[PDB]
Amino acid sequence: GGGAARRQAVDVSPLRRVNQAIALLTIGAREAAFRNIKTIAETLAEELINAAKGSSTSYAIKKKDELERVAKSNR
Amino acid sequence: LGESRSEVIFNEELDQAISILNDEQLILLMKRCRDWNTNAKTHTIAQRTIRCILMHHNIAKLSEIPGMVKIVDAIIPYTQRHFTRVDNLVEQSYILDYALVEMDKLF
Amino acid sequence: YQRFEQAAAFGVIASNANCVWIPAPGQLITSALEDVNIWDIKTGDLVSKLSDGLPPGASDARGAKPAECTYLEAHKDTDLLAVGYADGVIKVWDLMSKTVLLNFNGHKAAITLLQFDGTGTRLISGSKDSNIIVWDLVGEVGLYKLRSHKDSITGFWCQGEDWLISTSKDGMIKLWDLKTHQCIETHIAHTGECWGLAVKDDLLITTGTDSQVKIWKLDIENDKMGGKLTEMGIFEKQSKQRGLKIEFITNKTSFFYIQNADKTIETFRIRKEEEIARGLKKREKRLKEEEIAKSIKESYSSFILHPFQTIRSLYKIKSASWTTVSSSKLELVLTTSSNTIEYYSIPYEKRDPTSPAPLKTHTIELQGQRTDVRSIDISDDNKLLATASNGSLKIWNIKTHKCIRTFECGYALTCKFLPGGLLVILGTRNGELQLFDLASSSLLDTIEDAHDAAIWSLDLTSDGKRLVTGSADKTVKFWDFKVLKLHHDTTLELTDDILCVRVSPDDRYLAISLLDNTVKVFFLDSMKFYLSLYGHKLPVLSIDISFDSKMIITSSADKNIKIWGLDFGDCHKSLFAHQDSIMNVKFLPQSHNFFSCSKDAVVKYWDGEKFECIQKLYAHQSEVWALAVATDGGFVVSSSHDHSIRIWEETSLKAGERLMEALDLGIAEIEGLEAYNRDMKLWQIKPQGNAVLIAVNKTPEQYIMDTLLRIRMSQLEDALMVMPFSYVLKFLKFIDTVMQNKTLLHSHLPLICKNLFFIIKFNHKELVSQKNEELKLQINRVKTELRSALKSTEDDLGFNVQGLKFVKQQWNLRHNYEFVDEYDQQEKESNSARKRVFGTVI
Amino acid sequence: YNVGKAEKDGEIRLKNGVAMSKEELTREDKNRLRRALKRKRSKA
RNA sequence: AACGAGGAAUUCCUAGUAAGCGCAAGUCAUCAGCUUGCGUUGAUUACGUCCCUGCCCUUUGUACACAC
């Protein structure tokens, strides 16, 4: 933009969609068991169940909602 | 040509000038006409001047004229090349006929 | 490290210039170099001058020789003066505030003619390189440029808003139409070089290069060559050398003058039809006392015209101008080459000059050296001396910038002054020393036969008691003042010519050049041959030695100042300077710093300890001949062959995408105008044609075709792959439109056809999936028209191929020799067929 | 028949089969064609 | 008493690669405040484009068809 940067929306290709999917899930469970009594198995099970519900109490679904909102804003 | 794109070939008075040209000027005109026949962007102009000549001179004279069947001999093969390419273009142009068939059949 | 700036310029009364005369004798404009000057004729007193503010020498100034002011002509109705300088720059001055109001720079070479009508404020200029510019003063921009000549411009006559008639330095005359804005007619005028052009409403008079003036009749008739210019006659016999300027004038018998390049100028009268009929009858009675009418048609030119008279004026003239009164006086202002401006008058009663000779009034030669200055001298910071080979020893006061006394002494060479008695001494190219007084007459004791050759250099000791005169007799002579006569006392007879002499300010050394590239340095007190300095490869021209006898500066013809230390006789420092040649060099009177003036119009100021040109001075444009430095003040007076005296005082897009944008604009204009056509047809307001189409003046098909043409063939497949389907529909409509315009179609048939077939093969699935009766109708039109075009072109090709084969076959079976035996004719054929060589790898 | 340089002198003939007399060129174009032949025969 | 994985900036990186983990030698220069070898577990992300910062290149088809 010559100095005036701006976010434009683009569509995304399924190998990128699957790579985001896997990264989002595992980063969510690692940082949810960063320092707790929980461990990777239990937090990751928590996350996979919730995300498969889609129930939006979960890391990856929150970040997905964020990214379609940002596209929805400035397409 | 461009003005005469609307039995004449060019404007008629111009045709009369070409008809009453001299022999020496016919040689010089066909020298320049062969030169423009070389490339394929001025071939139309070359072909039209040639056709105007052939239709408005005595052909036995034109064969007779000294040092000209050399030039004529260099003129044929490039015109066969052009003939073949333009005929190829008619050939590709039957696509539109195909597409019309397909569209009416959909319709 | 002070810096010097120019303060003055004398003797520059009129040179290299074309004068413009103002009636009130009234005042007159000439130009100095780089500068204008105006004055009253009868008093001869300067009024004003115009130049840029910063002088050459302020360190802001640029390192280049300044532009000479080469033409000027005025407009009294608006009272402006348009001058043109030989860098081809046009400056217009106000004459009341004497300030510039605007400038112009369109040419490249020097400007010859300005000619301008303030009526609409049209300015017309013709320079040394062949184009004519026309301008408007009110808009101060470039209107336009007329260019078809080849060598230069020497004359042109405007007429109204319609025509120019111009002549070049290669001898052809060209008439230009200003509407269609271009050449119409051309005629070669004379064999060599035509120079002058002057127009009366009937007839046009031009000059050749060898005293043949030619006479045309001019009209406004509208044949091709006919009607316009016709070739009435040839008059001649002015001089032998060619003329330059012709001007008409009237009261009503009219007159015109030819100004030549020689000493002379000519004036003619042009008669009236009554005298024409009278001479016709007289000549016809001589005819009777047919082909004889052809003879009188041949003597036409001398029949109509008439040699009024001449002026065998003096030496040489630059410019001239008319003045008429009473039908009994014609007057010429006359700017010479040498520094004179003269008035000339002639009586007449519309019949005859009534005078044995033209009369010379009001010369102006007073403050102008009138020849070439050969030397300068400064005297006691108050007094200035200028000598020139007319002898015209002009004595000047600086602070008045003006002359005091003038003498004459023949071809003077070198000047010097005597503070004692305030008496000046000169020497010539003949061996005669001439010593002059200032209050009284010049000649006091004019010595002759002092030297059998030209003398060259001359100096006096720090007291003013003796004179050393070195002269091309290969001798130097030493002379003493007796009381006030001069007596030679002794002579040193060397081997070669003397080119300069100087003595120390402490009076101990004598420096004498030779014709060999050598200089000798003698002890003054007893003539002892103390040293010999060697090595300039070309002779020394000018010598200095220091203010205190420490160093010696020698400057020679091979462009290298040498600085010698005087004690042991060593060369300190060599210095290549001054691309032509050095004429002289001078010290500051206090310190080891020194000025140097060349033959190529630069004055270079040096430091004598870093040995660098501190400053370069770019005042003027001739061979600088001499220089002298104030005894204290640091102002320096430089004098040069341009008869001039200067004083320095001390102080974007991707292809394919641009196709889409063109496609949008084109389809928009097309469909809008179509809808408006539908509107008027239903009736029985123009939708506005867009800026790009209007501004380039291109119809929409030509626009889109031009973007398609500019795209390159490596990017054409990718581009048509890039556009979306909607733009493909637009593309199909565009192809329909060019089929409407057949001439464009047959012009660019391969481009169109290739693009069409590619874009359809690529978008085929969409294309058949679209159902639109518009699209079916469009495809029928496009397909039928493409077949018509390709088919008729092909039919030409077939006819030509058959015909040329028939021609060759006929000539074969009549000329080329035929055999019967098959092997024998096969031998013949493999002889005579075309053979082409080819480089095979084996 | 290739096309090569014209056997008069008054013409300049290019490689795409277009020939131009020396007279009927404007002076700038005579310049630019001299430039083109300059660099071409400067290599070869 | 200092510390809970290290700021702004810059550098480096595309498969047995990044990163972990130990064992062994010490080789005419270098190396023990260490240097080179040797195995063992072993990935995430690009693998496209000249749009950006650069970096080169050619602007004479020339070599021989055909095409362009």
SS3 for C52-111, per residue? CCCCECECCCCCCCCCCEEEEEEECCCCEEEEEECCCEEEEEECCCCCEEEEEECCCCCE
* Gap between the Cα atoms of C606 and C560, Å rounded: 13
Q: CA C766 → C1' E58, Å?
A: 41
**Resolution given for this structure, in angstroms:** 3.9
| C220-245: burial string, b at 16+ Cβ within 10 Å, e else | eeeeeeeebbeebbebeebbeebbbb
Q: Is the dihedral of CA C394, C397, C400, C404 positive or negative?
A: negative
Q: Distance between CA atoms of B10 and B18, rounded to whole angstroms?
A: 10
Per-residue CA distances from C76 to C20, C30, C79, C139, C324 (Å): 11, 16, 4, 20, 18
C-alpha torsion angle, residues D30, D35, D40, D42 (rounded to 10): 130
The whole-angstrom distance between C754's CA and the closest CA on chain B is: 9
- The answer to whether the CB of C288 falls within 8 A of the CB of C219 is no
Residues 6+ positions from A30 with CB-CB distance below 8 Å: A40, A43
Contact C131, C147 (CB under 8 A): yes
Cβ contact C568:C592 at 8 Å: no
Q: CA B73, B77, B78, B82 torsion: positive or negative?
A: positive
User: CA C598, CA C604: separation in Å to the nearest integer?
Assistant: 9
- DSSP letters of C6-21? EEEEES-SS-SS--EE
Q: Residues C229, C186: contact at Cβ < 8 Å?
A: no
> Is some CB atom of chain C closer than 8 A to the CB atom of B69?
yes
Question: E46 C1' – A9 CA distance, angstroms?
Answer: 21
Sheet with C540-545, side-by-side order of all strands:
C540-545, C551-556, C560-565, C570-576
Cα(C197)–Cα(C157) distance, integer angstroms: 7
Which of the nucleotides lies closest to A16 (Cα–C1')?
Answer: E45
Contact criterion met (CB below 8 Å) for C56 and C617: yes
∠C323-C327-C333 over CA atoms, to 5°? Answer: 15
Pair of tokens at residue C757:
């077939």
Please tell me the distance from the alpha carbon of residue C662 to that of residue A14, in angstroms, as a whole number. 36
Residues whose CB is less than 8 angstroms from the CB of residue B105 and which lie 6 or more positions away in sequence, other chains included: none
Residue C594 β-bridge partners: C587, C606
Q: Is C541:C583 a contact under the CB 8 Å cutoff?
A: yes
- Please report residues of B whose CB lies closer than 8 A to that of D1: 34, 38, 74, 78
The three-state secondary structure class of B17 is helix
Whether the Cβ atoms of residue C606 and residue C586 lie closer than 8 Å to each other: no
Interface size B-C, in CB pairs within 8 Å, comes to 113
User: How far is it, in rounded angstroms, from Cα C234 to Cα C779?
Assistant: 73
Q: Which of C440, C491, C438 is nearest to C468 (CA)?
A: C491
Q: Is C244 in contact with C260 (CB distance < 8 Å)?
A: yes
Angle between helices B69-92 and B43-55 (to 10 degrees): 120
Question: Which chains does D contact via 3+ CB–CB distances below 8 A?
Answer: B
Q: What was the elucidation method?
A: cryo-EM
C375 CB neighbour count, 10 Å cutoff: 23
Residue C489 C-alpha from the chain's centroid: 56
Burial zone of C835 (CB within 10 Å; 0-12 exposed, 13-18 middle, 19+ buried): exposed
Q: Cβ distance C753 to C791 under 8 Å? A: no
C-alpha–C-alpha distance, residues C426 and C455, integer Å: 10
d(CA B65, CA B23): 7
Cα four-point dihedral sign C100, C104, C105, C109: negative
| Total Cβ atoms within 10 A of residue C306 | 14
Q: Is the CB of D36 under 7 A from strand E?
A: yes
Tokens of C3: 């810096």
- Rounded CA gap, B68 and C430, in Å? 81
**Residue C588 parent element (H or E):** none
**Closest residue of C to B77, CA-based?**
C801
| d(C-alpha B46, C-alpha B13), whole Å | 19
Q: What is the DSSP string of chain D?
A: ------SSSSEEE-TTS-EEESTTS-HHHHHHHHHHHHHHHHH-
Q: How many residues are recorded in chain B? A: 107
Task: Please choose, from the candidates C533, C455, C534, the residue with its C-alpha nearest in 3D space to the C-alpha of residue C498.
Answer: C455
User: Any residues with CB less than 8 A from the CB of B86 and at least 6 apart, and which?
Assistant: C790, C793, C794, C797
Q: Is C365 exposed, middle or buried (0-12, 13-18, 19+ CB in 10 A)?
A: middle
Q: Say how many C-beta atoms besides its own lie within 10 A of residue C296's C-beta.
A: 15
C27: helix, coil or strand? strand
Do residues C768 and B103 touch, judged by C-beta distance below 8 A? yes
State the Cα–Cα distance between residues C178 and C748, nearest whole angstrom: 35
Residue C157's CB: how many other CB atoms inside 10 A? 16
Q: Identify from C705, C765, C799, C804 which residue to disrupt to test chain B contact, counting B C-beta atoms within 10 A and taking the largest count.
A: C804
What are the CB-based long-range contacts (under 8 Å, 24+) for C26-31? C28/C333, C28/C341, C29/C72, C29/C74, C29/C81, C30/C335, C30/C341, C31/C69, C31/C70, C31/C72, C31/C83
> For residue C488, what are the CA distances in angstroms to C274, C447, C500, C692?
78, 11, 19, 92
CB distance C804–B93 less than 8 Å? no
Residues in chain A: 75
Look up tokens 């189409």; give the residue: C693
Measured on CA atoms in the order B66, B67, B71, B73, is the torsion positive or negative?
Answer: positive
Closest by CA to C147, choosing from C116, C168, C117, C120, is: C168
Say if D and A touch: at least 3 Cβ pairs within 8 Å. no
- Reading the block at residue C158, the tokens are 């405007």
DSSP B4: G
Q: Judge whether C419 and C425 are in contact, CB under 8 Å.
A: no
Q: Does B12 touch chain C (CB under 8 A)?
A: no
- What's the gap in Å between the CA of D18 and the closest CA on chain B? 7
Structure tokens at C304: 């109509």
Task: Enter the DSSP assignment of C837.
Answer: -
For residue C437 the two structure tokens come to 């007084």
| 8-state DSSP, C382 | T
Closest approach of B52 to chain D, Cα-based (Å): 21
Q: Do chains B and A touch (3 or more CB pairs under 8 A)?
A: no
Q: If 0-12 CB within 10 Å is exposed, 13-18 middle and 19+ buried, where does residue C121 land?
A: middle
- Which one, of C363, C347, C269, C277, lies nearest residue C313 by Cα? C363
Phi, psi (degrees; rounded to nearest 5) at C193: -110, 125
CB contact under 8 A, C757 and B106: no
Question: Which of B54, B55, B68, B81 to substitute to test the interface with C, most C CBs within 10 Å?
Answer: B54
How many Å apart are CA C283 and CA C305, to the nearest integer?
A: 15
CB contact under 8 A, D17 and B32: no
Strand order in the sheet with C636-640: C4-10, C644-650, C636-640, C624-629
C383 φ, ψ (degrees, to nearest 5):
-130, 140
Instruction: State whether C779 and B99 contact (CB < 8 Å).
Output: yes
DSSP H stretches of helix in chain B: 12-19, 23-38, 43-55, 59-64, 69-92, 95-106
Q: Are B26 and B62 in contact (CB under 8 A)?
A: yes
CA–C1' A37–E2 (A): 29
Positions of strand E less than 7 angstroms from a protein CB = 44-46, 51, 59-64, 67-68
Interchain pair B74, D18: CB under 8 A: no
CB C303 within 8 A of CB C283: yes
Considering only CA atoms, give the Rg of chain B: 19
Q: How many CB atoms lie within 10 A of CB C73?
A: 16
Q: Is C395 helix (H, G, I), strand (E, B) or coil?
A: strand
Question: What is the H or E stretch that residue C765 is in?
Answer: helix C764-769
Contact C53, C355 (CB under 8 A): no
Listing DSSP states for C790-817 in one string gives HHHHHHHHHHHHHHHHHHHHHHHTTTS-
Count the residues in chain D: 44
Q: Please give the DSSP secondary-structure letter assigned to residue C629.
A: E
The CB density around residue C808, as the number of other CB atoms within 10 Å, is 18
DSSP C248-273: EE----EEEEEEESSSEEEEEEE--H
Is the alpha carbon torsion for C493, C496, C500, C506 positive or negative? negative
Closest-lying nucleotide for D15 based on CA to C1': E60
d(C-alpha C805, C-alpha C813), whole Å? 12
Q: What is the DSSP letter of C358?
A: P
- Estimate to the nearest angstrom the gap between the alpha carbon of C554 and the chain centroid: 37
Structure tokens at C706: 């031009």
Pairing mode, strands C132-136 and C122-127? antiparallel
Q: Are C126 and C146 in contact (CB under 8 A)?
A: no
**C603 neighbors C585 (Cβ within 8 angstroms):** no
Nearest to B89 among C753, C803, C808 (CB): C753
Q: Which residues in chain B are contacts of C761 at CB distance < 8 A?
A: 95
Q: Which two tokens stand for residue B74?
A: 């260099």
